[PDB]
Design goal:
Strand content of chain D: under 5%
Protein name (chain E): Large ribosomal subunit protein eL43A
Oligomer: part of a larger assembly
Structural class of chain E: alpha+beta
Order of helices and strands of chain D: HH
Structural class of chain D: mainly alpha
Strand content of chain E: 5-15%
Largest interface: A-E, 40 and 33 residues
Chains: A mainly beta (248), B alpha/beta (69), C mainly alpha (93), D mainly alpha (50), E alpha+beta (93), F alpha+beta (106)
Largest sheet of chain D: none
Bound molecules: zinc ion
Strand order of the largest sheet of chain E: 1-2-3
Shape of chain E: extended
Radius of gyration of chain E: 18 Å
Number of helices of chain D: 2
Order of helices and strands of chain E: HEEEH
Keywords (chain E): Cytoplasm, Metal-binding, Ribonucleoprotein, Ribosomal protein, Zinc, Zinc-finger
Number of strands of chain E: 3
Number of helices of chain E: 2
Family (chain E): Belongs to the eukaryotic ribosomal protein eL43 family.
Pfam families (chain E): Ribosomal_L37ae (PF01780)
GO molecular function (chain E): structural constituent of ribosome; zinc ion binding
Chain lengths: 248, 69, 93, 50, 93, 106
RNA sequence: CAGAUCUUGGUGGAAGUAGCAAAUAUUCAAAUGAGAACUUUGAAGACUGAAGUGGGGAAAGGUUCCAUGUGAACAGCAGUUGGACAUGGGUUAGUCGAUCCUAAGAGAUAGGGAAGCUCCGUAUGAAAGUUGCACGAUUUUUCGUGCCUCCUAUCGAAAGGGAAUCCGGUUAAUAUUCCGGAACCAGAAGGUGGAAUCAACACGGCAACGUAAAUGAAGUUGGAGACGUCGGCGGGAGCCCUGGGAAGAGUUCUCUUUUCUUUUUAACAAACCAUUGAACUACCCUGAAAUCGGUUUAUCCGGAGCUAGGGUAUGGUGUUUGGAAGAGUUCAGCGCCUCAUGCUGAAUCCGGUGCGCUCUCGACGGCCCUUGAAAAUCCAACGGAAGAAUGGCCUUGUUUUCACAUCUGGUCGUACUCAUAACCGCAGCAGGUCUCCAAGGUGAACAGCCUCUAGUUGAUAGAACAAUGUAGAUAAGGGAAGUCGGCAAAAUGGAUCCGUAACUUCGGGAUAAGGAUUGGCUCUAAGGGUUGGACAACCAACUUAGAACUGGUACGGACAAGGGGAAUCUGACUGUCUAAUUAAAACAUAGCAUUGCGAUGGCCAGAAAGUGGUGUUGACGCAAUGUGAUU
């Protein structure tokens, strides 16, 4: 046969389009000021990052060791404004836009850009309108239980930092794209993944679903998890199929 | 090219080191133009009266080479 | 031919190939009328014929397509001034 | 294209020099068969290929 | 003149894309292109930009607000701010 | 009417191929290649253009004298007058309140 | 060797045969020449008709460019001619490009794999130093220590960024490169003059801010470079149009104070600059506003300070000048071998116009689940390192970000074509190949048609109209009876005024369907600008509507330019594909639904890797599928 499109997406023309992107959205390097006290920064810009629904925030801090200022690229939280003072550290106040360790915050708080490990500069809850809820704590072997946007429950060390509030950008998926042009423009600044040709519309050489006098798969679309590349197409390791008629 | 308004500055520029030559131009409207060729610029002074032009020509430095156009 | 057209010849329906808006845009006609009306209102306000209270009203009516031309605007101003002067005379007397 | 490198211009100079007639006194040498050759290159018939 | 019964701003889309999709776009488009009050200035001069940037016009409060895609503030953000304030006030004591 | 040609070998309407039609003292209509317009320096705090400074290309400022690129004031040529006034008032008020907080902390 | 659709070479019948028919078109006279339908000159008739058969470029070609000769081969006819042949000549730059910078990317080095050719990797797990500071130093200075801080290989654009040149003339062929004139930029020393500082770093304005200068080390910060698309509005430059004057030319049975050509002002420099045209555009001062006012074509602004008055800045493709009339252009004379082709007379003037065209600028508005490069380089600010002139006068450093002045600016390309003959397609092939400027009339118009400038008259020719053809037209009466099928053709067609159904997602259908008018001439009425004492004689303007009269009952008079309707199947629509037999109901699409994955992960890649993509990503995400608007 032939190498399928999924196998062909290893790079090259399938890389992300990052010319217009302004920078990574890392929180900050976990330093002495954030570990022991707090540090004050000023939000000097709130800008639009192409390919990302949520806005980005350029925040200027003061270097504690050298005569210099450092500009960060926080993920903008809803309600943040330019000229606002944000505080990052263990002793920061429970205010929207501040970055605090998860272990220094009560139960039920809504946060964003949460670290999986203390120092990775934000991993969880970064897309627009998404947030992470702090479910509980455990002082002995200090670890915090949190609820992720997908409903999963994750345990993190009680030193990971998170931003109080919700990622700015509100509900973006509520508006229909309404035409291929909007879909074309949406994915143009993201990558070469649009449009998509159905496998049953191809030939047997191209896709496992191609061929036949009628457009049909001919075999179960649910494929095993331990499937070789080139045949891991369709529904991979599907626990169940059909309409989700009641789920939690 | 630069233009000179007062006659005093025209004589001062003529009394310099770069004043290689001067040119006299007589126009149809009985106007006289005194032009100094310096190292960088050409300085032109406009005289609308013959009497003042004659006095200016007589007052020009003797070492200056004056040529009629 | 241009002189004849200036007099008014070679103008009828058989000599037109484009639509009326194509030959003369209604946007330009409205723009010309609005500028003329606003210029007249400003001149009257500066000359003292009307006050700012009446000028503001007439400005909004002109934007609202109340006056067809200068004559209509002048007539409306004359009626407003006459009524105001008559009411002032009644109040004074 | 009026925008040529030094190497290209030298190659053009060499090509123009090579495309010249052979003198008769050269062909008159005893035991020589240099009278005619097909190496004559015209700008429209055979291209230089850089 | 009313000039349109239902489609409103959506009327630029013609007869295509489906009536229900057109209405759903219409409501969100109205929210996106509606004015909002500046909490720091009071003027209704807050415009959207890039689906999340909200800027206030004028010589004052030139700040940029980070809000929702179509509205300055969403219900989820308002509830989150309220519960954060309640948690902060109950943890300060 | 007379028609013109580009004076250079660049044959495209790019931003570096700006041209202006001129009439010479020979009754000749021909192109004249010109540079882009200059930009007034902007305020560092408010982003507004700075009053009293000409709009020039970046290297054209080197030929100017010092006073023509600066306004005779603190932060002149970098911040606007309103921005400087706001900074002065903000600095004085915050320092006064810092002194008040220090004295009252005892 | 008689064969192998044998190999190579040569040569036949077909045969003086098919044919040398797209792109409207040529004719007369003279010259040269042995020879003229193709050469040259003059005349006439035409075409390209500014989205050109015109003038230039990018790529590509490489001498095809120019002059002088030849006509053996080629120019499918010819040749006195050529992009052919032969001999010579021709490309002149500090300002135009490359060179400099960086983008997508390429790629050494450290290091790690690989038997290896080599693969990954670009501050990467590297002792990856160029730079900041007077410690010696006669005495008025870049030479050996010390302590030092997030620097860093390079290549990569003749359309991205960028320091700087214009006019006139000149050659057979080069010029923004040469000549004459007039400028600009960068670097280097410091040659003068000016300015401040008597005892160190200026003044004025309330302010916006201004000046001829107005000392400023490291470090830090800021700005410029530097940015999408569409729409209307206002201005400027060039072009177009129009009224006079001057000069020349055309017509002149008749008429036309007539028709045509010229009437030009560059870079650069200075002063003003809302005046003449275009922002109360931004900011500042006085002042405090409801009977709210100001204001754009477009509804924005204002006790977070409106209107009004007065100022500050932004400043050229605006005005007045210099350049600069000495140039260029037009006309009229003298020499009369005329030699340097010279000399001598005049004009080159005064006005106006705009929903006009091209470019540009200014203030705006709409759109995005699209927000629309980087770097070199330059400038500004915070800050305070360093300084030494002395005897109120004869005496220094600084500034060279003030004015004048000196020197230097190297290397490479520069001819010509850019195409129905200079490129590619076997060729001098009706094919293909990126882009700049774009006159008048008709007309909505960069539509079609004619014309001006410019170019060309080049597609083997002559004679005659047989059949059958190719292309273009018409046809009495019938009107699809033809044919698988109204295939083809015909019919409709512009604009203005009436009128317009079923159905529908209420947006459409719709120009539905169906009707009337259209010329020329003479008038009438209404709709706008400055301007002399209720007004007003002009100048400068275009529209709309109506009426009479008239003729071929004709008039979008050529050109230009929808046939329409009633149903069924199917795809929702816009869009995409089988280059060279299938454009579709096929693909894609928005919408709908499902699956995996919380990073020690999902999916993909790699021989391996201290390896790569998604990922500058985090479930409103990525990856894998099916169905295909709405209901
Ligand atoms: Zn506000």
């Amino acid at each position: 046969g032939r190498v399928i499109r999924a196998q062909r997406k290893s790079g090259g023309i399938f890389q992300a389009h990052t010319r217009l992107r302004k920078g990574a959205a890392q929180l900050r390097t976990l330093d002495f000021a954030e570990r022991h006290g707090y540090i004050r920064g000023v939000v000097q810009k709130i800008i639009h990052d192409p390919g990302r629904g949520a806005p980005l925030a350029k925040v200027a801090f003061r270097n504690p060791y050298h005569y210099r200022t450092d500009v960060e690229t926080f993920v903008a939280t809803e309600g943040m404004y330019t000229g606002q003072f944000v505080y990052c550290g263990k002793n920061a106040a429970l205010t929207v836009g501040n970055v605090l360790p998860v272990g220094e915050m009560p139960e039920g708080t809504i946060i964003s850009n949460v670290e999986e490990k203390a120092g990775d500069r934000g991993a969880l809850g970064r897309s627009s309108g998404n947030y992470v809820i702090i479910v509980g704590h455990d002082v002995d072997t200090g670890k915090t239980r949190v609820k992720l946007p997908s409903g999963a429950k994750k345990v993190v060390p009680s030193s990971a930092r998170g931003v109080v509030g919700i990622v700015a950008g509100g509900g973006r998926i509520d508006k229909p794209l309404l035409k291929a042009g909007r879909a074309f423009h949406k994915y143009r600044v993201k990558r070469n993944c649009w449009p998509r040709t159905r496998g049953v519309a191809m030939n047997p050489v191209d896709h496992p679903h191609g061929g036949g006098n009628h457009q049909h798969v001919g075999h179960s679309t649910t494929v095993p998890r331990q499937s070789a590349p080139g045949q891991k197409v369709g529904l991979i390791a599907a626990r169940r199929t059909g309409l989700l008629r009641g789920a939690a | 090219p630069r233009q000179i308004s007062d006659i005093k500055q025209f004589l001062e520029i003529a009394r310099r080191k770069d004043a290689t030559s001067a040119r006299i131009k007589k126009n149809t409207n009985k106007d006289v133009k005194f032009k100094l060729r310096c190292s960088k610029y050409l300085y032109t002074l406009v005289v609308a009266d013959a009497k003042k032009a004659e006095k200016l020509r007589q007052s020009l430095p003797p070492d200056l080479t004056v040529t009629e156009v | 031919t241009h002189a004849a057209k200036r007099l008014g010849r070679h103008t009828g329906y058989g000599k037109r190939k484009g639509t009326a808006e194509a030959r003369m845009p209604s946007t330009v006609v409205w723009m010309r009328r609005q500028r003329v009306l606003r210029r007249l209102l400003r001149k009257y306000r500066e000359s003292g014929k009307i006050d700012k209270h009446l000028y503001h009203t007439l400005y909004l009516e002109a934007k609202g397509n109340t006056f067809k031309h200068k004559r209509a605007l002048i007539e409306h101003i004359q009626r407003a001034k006459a009524e105001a002067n008559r009411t002032k005379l009644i109040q004074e007397q | 294209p009026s925008h040529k490198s030094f190497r290209t211009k030298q190659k053009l100079a060499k090509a123009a020099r090579q495309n010249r007639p052979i003198p008769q006194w050269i062909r008159l040498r005893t035991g020589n068969t240099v009278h005619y050759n097909m190496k004559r290159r015209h700008w429209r018939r055979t291209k230089l290929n850089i | 003149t009313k000039r349109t019964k239902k489609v409103g701003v959506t009327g630029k889309y013609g007869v295509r894309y489906g009536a229900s999709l057109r209405r759903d776009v219409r409501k969100i488009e109205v929210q996106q292109h509606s004015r909002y009050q500046c909490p720091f200035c009071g003027r209704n001069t807050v415009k959207r930009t890039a689906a999340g940037i909200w800027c206030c016009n004028g010589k004052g409060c030139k700040k940029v607000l980070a809000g929702g895609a179509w509205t300055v503030t969403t219900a989820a953000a308002t509830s989150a701010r309220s519960t954060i304030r309640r948690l902060r006030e109950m943890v300060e004591v | 009417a007379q028609r013109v040609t580009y004076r250079r070998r660049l044959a495209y309407n790019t931003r570096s191929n700006k041209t202006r039609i001129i009439k010479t003292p020979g009754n000749n209509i021909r192109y004249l290649h010109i540079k882009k317009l200059g930009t007034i320096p902007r305020c560092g705090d408010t982003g507004v253009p700075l009053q009293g400074i000409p709009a020039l290309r970046p290297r054209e400022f080197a030929r100017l004298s010092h006073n023509q690129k600066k306004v005779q004031r603190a932060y002149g040529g970098c911040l606007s007058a309103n921005a400087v006034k706001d900074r002065i008032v903000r600095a004085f008020l915050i320092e006064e309140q810092k002194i008040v907080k220090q004295k009252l902390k005892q």
